[PDB]
């Protein structure tokens, strides 16, 4: 199926996925001169107090750290969102090298690693509905340079060796992700998709301007996970980020100045 390889990899994902070249894909590059401030949009609301971590997995892509999503325990709001959107897992996307690694770029930059948290909108229900809706999900995604090391990141460092290869989780509760957070909450939104197959055009994507900094040794064991399963030859879990996507009939609108 599909990866991250030569013959697997975004280069490919339109024949199976043909939404790949579509109206509304993700990543971008966020240029960020011509992006425009807009004054109307609320202020970003995060209230992640009650947020109930309860696994991490290795699904041979990426690794996620899931919560309960079965009530308004952790939830996103304001920005550019009608309505409330519910933490249903996070996850991140990394490169090989440093300067490589993430999925959106700012002013062609890449960053070493992208954090997404994913958010569905209560109003359809579930997860798997929202999915099918232009406005379905929020995105909120946060970039990580490589300098001193994110406390807060720790805990999830200490448990990737329990979930080296593909189809491996581990126990992961009692994690509060707001210690994943930088501390501004300036934002760049606009409408995309999934950045993996299906790529579905469902996400308002909400990309923070303030990167957060983790250390070298931090993402080098990010570096040392498995896209293989456990008793497969070693394909290290690097580089799994798409490229961005033209930008073609949208706007990124800034929450700043
Ligand atoms: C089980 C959840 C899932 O596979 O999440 C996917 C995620 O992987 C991880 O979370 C590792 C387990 C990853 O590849 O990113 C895409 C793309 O998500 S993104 N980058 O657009 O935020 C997600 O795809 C989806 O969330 C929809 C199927
Ligand atoms: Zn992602």
């Known amino acids: 199926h599909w990866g991250y390889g030569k013959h697997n990899g975004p280069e490919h994902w339109h024949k199976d996925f043909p939404i790949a070249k579509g109206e509304r894909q993700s990543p971008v590059d966020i240029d960020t001169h011509t992006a425009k401030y807009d004054p109307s949009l609320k202020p970003l609301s995060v209230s992640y107090d009650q947020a109930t971590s309860l696994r991490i997995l290795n699904n041979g892509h990426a690794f996620n750290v899931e919560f309960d999503d079965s009530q308004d325990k ?46 569905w909108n209560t109003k359809y229900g579930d997860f798997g509905k929202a999915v099918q809706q232009p406005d379905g999900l929020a995105v909120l995604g946060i970039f990580l340079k490589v300098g001193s090391a994110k406390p807060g990141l720790q805990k999830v460092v200490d448990v990737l060796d329990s979930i080296k290869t593909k189809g491996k989780s581990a126990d992961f509760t009692n994690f509060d992700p707001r210690g994943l957070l930088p501390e501004s909450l300036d934002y760049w939104t606009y409408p995309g998709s999934l950045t993996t197959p299906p790529l579905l055009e469902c996400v308002t994507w909400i990309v923070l301007k303030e990167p957060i900094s983790v250390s070298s040794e931090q993402v080098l064991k990010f570096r040392k996970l498995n896209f293989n399963g456990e008793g497969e030859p070693e394909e290290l879990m690097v580089d799994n980020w798409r490229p961005a996507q033209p930008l073609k009939n949208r706007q990124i609108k800034a929450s700043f100045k």
């Not at 009608?82 to 996070?90: A, E, M, N, P, S």
């Not at 996307?93 to 958010?119: F, P």
């Open 74 to 119: 952790a939830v996103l709001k304001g920005g550019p969102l009608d309505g409330t959107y519910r933490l249903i897992q996070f996850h991140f996307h990394w490169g090989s090298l440093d300067g490589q690694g993430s999925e959106h770029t700012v002013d062609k930059k890449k960053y070493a690693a992208e954090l997404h948290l994913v958010h």
